[model samples]
Target: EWEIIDIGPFTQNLGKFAVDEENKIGQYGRLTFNKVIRPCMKKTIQVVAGYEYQLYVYASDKLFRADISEDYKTRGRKLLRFNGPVPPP
Candidate 1:
């Protein structure tokens, strides 16, 4: 069985990135974790995990975005989308 949970929005600091006058833009961060898949067997189990980080430069030319994974290898094939427009700094 598979289930999905919505953890809602989370925010993090961009520190000095938020104060860059040349960009005239703001940078923010968010994270969400939901759902866990496990085996029903009682035996010891192990799974190898890996992760890939991706960046999405925002249209404002000041903000940067990325998607991080909890179980990197498990989500290696998943498709990620960034709908917001991004500009070069």
Candidate 2:
């Protein structure tokens, strides 16, 4: 048995990162993806101390967030967290 903290829903996109239309100065852009659940809909990593989350798609026209960070010393990076609460089931 284990304890649950959250059901973190997330969207796995089957596309690429575009340009941010709103906050481009400090942020990237929305993860534009094809409208589909079979490949996008998903759940966060199952954890006992944290939570199990769900995923959504951007093409679905749903609102979400993409939290990320970079270490210039490292040279490169990509989307770190693509999460949201839209639909699927």
Candidate 3:
């Protein structure tokens, strides 16, 4: 079970990391900050974590974070021992 966090009610785009016919001939992904989210509509837009789709985390002034760090080298990691009224998953 995954509860919603408080991060963004913002709009984002939906697409996959494409591959060529060879699948490995070229490793490329259009994951640009502007590319993965927006420029304009009509780009097969999709809903992401928000109010209607809540996942906005207000721990600090940041974006896209997981407290549940898999290891110690994680930045903005705060998954376990998270004492907050929000994101009680």
Candidate 4:
């Protein structure tokens, strides 16, 4: 399963309408977890920016997890690390 862990603020540079108040400028980040599949099941990550537009992804088992920073100063932050299978809530 996949979920949006966190989000960052948006930026703009168009004078009065420059700043991205809607927080829709930079790329949105996400994290996903799979337990029933194997090393070749093929996993994908999708990011929805708004109503009609979305991002599609095809990732390997090794690269299924990712980390993204809210700002540009920091390096790759840990996004997902599973010690065991995710328990049911």
Superposed on all Cα atoms, the candidates' RMSDs to the truth, in angstroms, are 25.3, 25.6, 17.8, 23.8
Write one digit per residue (lDDT tens) for candidate 4, span 1-89: 53332222211122223223334453443322212212222236666432321222234322222333332344334433323222322
Error of 1 at 87 (Å): 14
Q: Which prediction has the highest TM-score against the true structure?
A: 2
Judging by lDDT, tell me the better candidate of 3 and 4: 3
* Model 3: per-residue Cα lDDT at residue 37: 38
Estimate TM-scores for all models.
Answer: 0.23, 0.24, 0.15, 0.15
Please list the residue runs of candidate 3 whose C-alpha ends up more than 4 Å from where it truly belongs after superposition.
1-13, 17-35, 43-89
Model 1 weakest 10-residue run by lDDT: 7-16
Backbone clashes, candidate 2: 11
Against the true structure, candidate 2 reaches a TM-score of 0.24
Query: 66 in model 2: Cα distance from truth in Å?
Result: 0.9
Judged by lDDT against the true structure, how good is candidate 3?
A: 0.36
lDDT of 1: 0.43
How do the residues 1-89 of candidate 2 rate in per-residue lDDT, one tens digit apiece? 33333322332222223223333454545443444333333346653332233334464577666555544445344556776653544
Sort by lDDT, best first: what order? Answer: 1, 2, 3, 4
If candidate 3 were superposed on the true structure by all CA atoms, what would the RMSD be?
17.8
By summed lDDT, the worst window of 10 consecutive residues in model 2 runs over 11-20
